[PDB]
Design a protein around this ligand. Structure first.
Ligand SMILES: O=CCCCC[C@@H]1SC[C@@H]2NC(=O)N[C@@H]21
Ligand SMILES: [Mn+2]
Ligand SMILES: [Mn+2]
Lengths: 166, 562, 131, 261, 41
């Protein structure tokens, strides 16, 4: 039931989501930093706002408080964080629901369940999967899409074994 | 200031909603403080910047003005030269100015200056044009109509008054000041009893507020005392003083009218005030320290508004006047407002620049020749045009009769003697008049009487056929007022769109290489334009502009004009 | 790129963006798709080889160089791949005629030629050439 | 001494003597020089603060000026001068201050103000009702803003009030017109100010100073925070114990304000 | 070479910049192509 959507992000994932949103007939907001005044992603939404003159290049996309005004200002009612600033962040999520704004990610308990290291380890053992100590390793990952109704499929795997250190 | 905060203010606007026009006036009368009407949006720049200031520059501080003037009586923000100019030079719609400001400043009354005969027009209109204009202006947000007449002829003021009363809005009936009541030898006619008898008249005509319009800044400090003291016991109407600071005596006049009990005064922001503008509100506020009545305003906000207009005024420097000092010669010639400059930029275009002296001198004499008249637009244009002509043809109080049969007087004079601007207070010298009309008949009644009502039907079907289709009430009334100028606005708008959205340095100067410019369209959605380069001219003389609009590379073709 | 099996998700690249040192540089996301894995690879390499990005260095060649590799086409590869395949880094820049020729023309157009006086440019007989 | 003598000889008849801190002991030396030269010695008080407003100073009160005027009467000045170097003298204040001193001291009172707030003329109006003997003006085309109030203007302003300006206006309009043209030769030197300015009452910078001090704030890197410099100029006044500001004391406070931002 | 050839339109050259570099806008075999020329004197 979402009339408009703000992306707490930039670049490809922003554009990507803007497009998804356009497809569902949804009005979209973009945020930018002073360094992104002319980044592609500013242009590809219906609405564009400065996160604030006084906020540096790194800070712009990481200020929980400041992003959320832009939101409330634009009569927005959902935020998609994309990946890689506040997408994993426990506080940002909490804040969103509080302001009435819908966080497009898993539930509040999931983020710190999985976000810490030491805690992920506990969770898995509670559903027993493997762990302990790695020759000719292969990096394999499984996409899962679950709803808010305990219907949770998986979209098979990928093979991210082609890497340099990080 | 935030719109939420503005949505919560109650000022003279919502007063009008609750108590109606007669209730507003009543409430003016009970205020101890002098109330102020700010004139930054009309008369300040009409006087200092040839009416050039653009909606965009006003929209920008509107929310700060709503906060700053919250306790004001009104914002004078429409009428005068602003309708024509906006359409004509700024090529923007003065109705969009009215309505965009209305939304941003919901709390304070809106004032416009409304000329009796023709509203805001330039010729004479039938009565149903006046009514249409006032209907639509009221609908669009105008609350206080300062109805004035070029010649203080009350008969000519009635039609507008009716309109405003019907619209349920506030009519201020205006008296224009000339002569000098301090000086028995200035005039028999323009004496203190003359203002009293005319106040008493506008009051019997149902005007809610009485305005003294001192358009040539002629009302001397003591005279302001005397005049307002007499009017206040002569009538029940709140009195609303308007003057210009061209003599440098604006503040003192305002002080004296305050001691004498005036209700509302017109000031401007400091940076936009003084000489031919109104006296400064920032100064008066301090000038009254330790006297009996206080100016009702926020000076901290005013100092802040002044700083804004300091910078914006800079955008308009090609439109500043020569005038850089007060002038006390006005007491002799009585040249209203800008005229003194509007009329030298003209005496030069006729190889008279070298003897504007003798022109100043003829203006005065001409005034007594035309039998001592009130000199606002457009009567000041009559007197001016006659002075030019008379200097240029080496003419005389006596030569104008003797040699008048072969003379060929400027249109605007024939038209004054023909009655087309109304009836002067002292009639026409019949012989002066014969020699200028050369036979044609003068009007008896007020001009509008003689006019076929306009048929807005025919106008609508003419606009709809010209434009795509759907056309509004404002469009229709605009065209009736300014046919040529309205059509030129549509053509411009087809070619180029809504230009009132560009900022002023872009609207006048374009852009420079490397420049990036943002045009605000909606909230959060702006046109990002950046200029990569300008080419050399092709064969048919077209230079190619290389933009990057909204990131996207883009290419435009302009004919170089040389 | 475009065409069969190619998907492109815009990043920072276009027209004339400046890319800054402030964020992860990602210009385009390029994905390809076919029924065979080899076929998707030879699709990737087509597409990579089509791209032109100019004014910045890119990672295209390295990427070409992983695609072409038998040991990635084999499928049997481990996260130890890149580290135990040193020759992924063997990168010749080819003689990008086009670019160079624009540099030369630009240079002469603006700074003229050594021994040669700046006149209006010849090829000024429409008598072409017997053959 | 050598300067006053030569000055006298060469035609100067009236010496207006002021100190930048209103320190009487520093004026005695020029006064003795003037007395010895048989010429007129004008004893200047500089106006600061704001006698209408008790919050402004426990020091610059009506009583401070009265006291300071009598002290000048004792050193034997022939005229009393009030230099309102920043135009801080509000209208009601001038009325009250000239009142007191006209009953405090038997000295003619000579009033000098600048029109920078826009109220100059109003001030002269008020001082004139209070009994003042001489005022400083300028011709219209040489007046206004940071200059003197206009003589031409004041002339017509006082029509119908009891006293009047003793001058020839028709002659003044002539003076005005001549200077209006001459001013033109000097345009490369024209103030940047073009408006009256009532922040004058908060920061108290004299004369032209607040545009020099603004040049300077730019020729450094503080043009954007000029609001902070105006504020510091003010605060730096109290830091220094609340002082009269005319050359060179006003430079001191400006210099300090620049330094501290 | 045989039936491969470069088609170049020079559309415009720009006024220089502080660093002292002109921007040449071309079209090349169907492509917008921008180039930086240093300007010696
Ligand atoms: O400074 C002049 C522009 C550079 C032109 C370069 C050409 S390449 C062949 C010939 N050899 C040179 O040293 N310069 C010209
Ligand atoms: Mn006016
Ligand atoms: Mn001085």
């Amino acid at each position: 039931q979402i009339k408009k959507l703000l992306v707490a992000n930039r670049g490809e994932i922003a554009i990507r989501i803007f497009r998804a949103a356009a497809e569902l007939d949804i009005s979209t907001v973009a945020i930018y930093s002073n360094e992104d005044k002319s980044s592609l992603h500013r242009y590809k939404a219906d609405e564009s706002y400065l996160v604030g003159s006084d906020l540096g290049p790194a800070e712009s996309y990481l200020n929980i408080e400041r992003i959320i005004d832009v939101a409330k200002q634009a009569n927005v009612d959902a935020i998609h964080p994309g990946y890689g600033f506040l997408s994993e962040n426990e506080q940002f999520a909490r804040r969103c629901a509080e302001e009435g704004i819908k966080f497009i990610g898993p539930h509040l308990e999931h983020l710190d369940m999985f976000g810490d290291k030491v805690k992920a380890r506990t969770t898995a053992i509670k559903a027993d999967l493997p762990v302990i100590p790695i020759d000719n390793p292969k990096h394999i990952e499984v996409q899962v899409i679950g709803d808010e109704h305990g219907n949770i499929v998986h979209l098979f795997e990928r093979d991210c074994s082609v890497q340099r250190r990080h | 200031v935030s719109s939420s905060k503005i949505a919560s203010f109650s000022g003279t606007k919502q007063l009008l909603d609750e108590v109606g026009p007669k209730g507003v006036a009543e409430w003016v009368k009970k205020q101890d403080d002098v109330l102020l009407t700010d004139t930054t949006f009309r008369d300040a720049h009409q006087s200092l910047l040839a009416t050039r200031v653009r909606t965009k520059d006003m929209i920008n501080i509107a929310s700060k003005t709503a906060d700053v003037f919250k306790d004001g009586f009104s914002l004078e923000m429409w009428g005068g030269a602003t309708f024509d100019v906006a359409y004509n030079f700024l090529k923007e719609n003065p109705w969009e100015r009215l309505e965009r400001l209305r939304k941003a400043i919901p709390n304070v009354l809106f004032q416009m200056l409304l000329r009796a005969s023709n509203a805001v027009g330039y010729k004479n209109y039938p009565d149903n044009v006046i009514h249409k204009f006032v209907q639509e202006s009221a609908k669009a947000g105008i609350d206080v109509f300062r109805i004035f007449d070029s010649l203080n002829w009350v008969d000519q003021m009635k039609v507008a008054n009716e309109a405003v009363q019907e619209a349920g809005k506030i009519s201020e009936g205006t008296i224009c000041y000339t002569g000098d009541i301090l000086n028995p030898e200035r005039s028999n006619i323009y004496t203190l009893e003359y203002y009293v008898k005319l106040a008493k008249e506008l009051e019997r005509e149902g005007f809610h507020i009485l305005a003294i319009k001192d358009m040539a800044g002629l009302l001397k400090p003591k005279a302001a005392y005397e005049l307002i003291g007499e009017l206040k016991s002569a009538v029940d109407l709140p009195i609303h003083l308007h003057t210009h600071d061209t003599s440098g005596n604006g503040l003192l006049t305002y002080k004296q009218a305050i001691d004498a009990g005036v209700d509302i005064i017109d000031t401007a922001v400091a940076s936009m005030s003084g000489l031919t503008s109104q006296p400064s509100a920032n100064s008066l506020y301090y000038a009254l320290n330790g006297f009996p009545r206080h100016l009702r305003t926020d000076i901290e906000g005013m100092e802040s508004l002044s700083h804004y207009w300091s910078t914006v005024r800079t955008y308009y420097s090609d439109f500043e006047s020569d005038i850089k000092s007060p002038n006390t010669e006005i007491y002799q010639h009585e040249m209203p407002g800008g005229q003194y400059s509007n009329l030298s930029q003209q005496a030069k275009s006729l190889g008279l620049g070298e003897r504007f002296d003798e022109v100043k001198d003829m203006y005065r004499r001409v005034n007594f020749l035309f039998g001592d008249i009130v000199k606002v637009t457009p009567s000041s244009k009559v007197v001016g045009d006659m002075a030019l002509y008379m200097v240029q043809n080496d003419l005389d109080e006596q030569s104008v009769i003797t040699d008048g049969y072969k003379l060929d007087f400027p249109e605007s004079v024939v038209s004054f003697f023909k009655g087309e601007i109304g009836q002067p207070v002292n009639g026409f010298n019949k012989d002066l008049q014969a020699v200028i009309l050369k036979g044609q008949e003068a009007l008896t009644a007020r001009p509008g009487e003689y006019l076929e009502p306009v048929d807005f039907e025919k106008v609508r079907e003419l606009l709809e056929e010209e434009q795509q289709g759907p056309v509004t009430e404002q469009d229709i009334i605009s065209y009736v007022l300014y046919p040529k100028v309205y059509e030129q606005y549509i053509q411009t708008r087809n070619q180029y769109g809504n230009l009132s959205l560009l900022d002023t340095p872009t609207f006048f100067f374009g852009m420079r290489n490397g420049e990036t410019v943002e045009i605000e369209i909606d909230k959060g959605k702006r046109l990002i334009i950046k200029l990569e380069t300008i080419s050399e001219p092709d064969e048919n003389g077209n230079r190619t502009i290389y933009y990057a609009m909204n990131g996207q590379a883009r290419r435009i073709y302009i004919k170089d004009e040389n | 790129s475009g065409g069969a099996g190619v998907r492109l998700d815009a990043g920072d690249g276009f027209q004339g963006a400046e890319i800054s040192p402030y964020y992860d540089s990602l210009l385009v996301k390029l994905s390809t798709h076919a029924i065979s894995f080899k076929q998707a690879e030879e699709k990737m390499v087509r597409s990579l080889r089509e791209m032109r990005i100019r004014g910045v260095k890119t990672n295209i060649p390295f990427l070409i160089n992983v695609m072409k590799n038998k040991k990635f086409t084999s499928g049997d590869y481990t996260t130890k791949f890149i580290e135990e395949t040193p020759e992924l880094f063997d990168i010749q820049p080819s003689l990008d005629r086009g670019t160079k020729t624009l540099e030369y023309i630009g240079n002469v157009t603006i700074n003229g030629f050594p021994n040669v006086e700046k006149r209006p440019k010849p090829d000024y007989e429409l008598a072409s050439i017997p053959t």
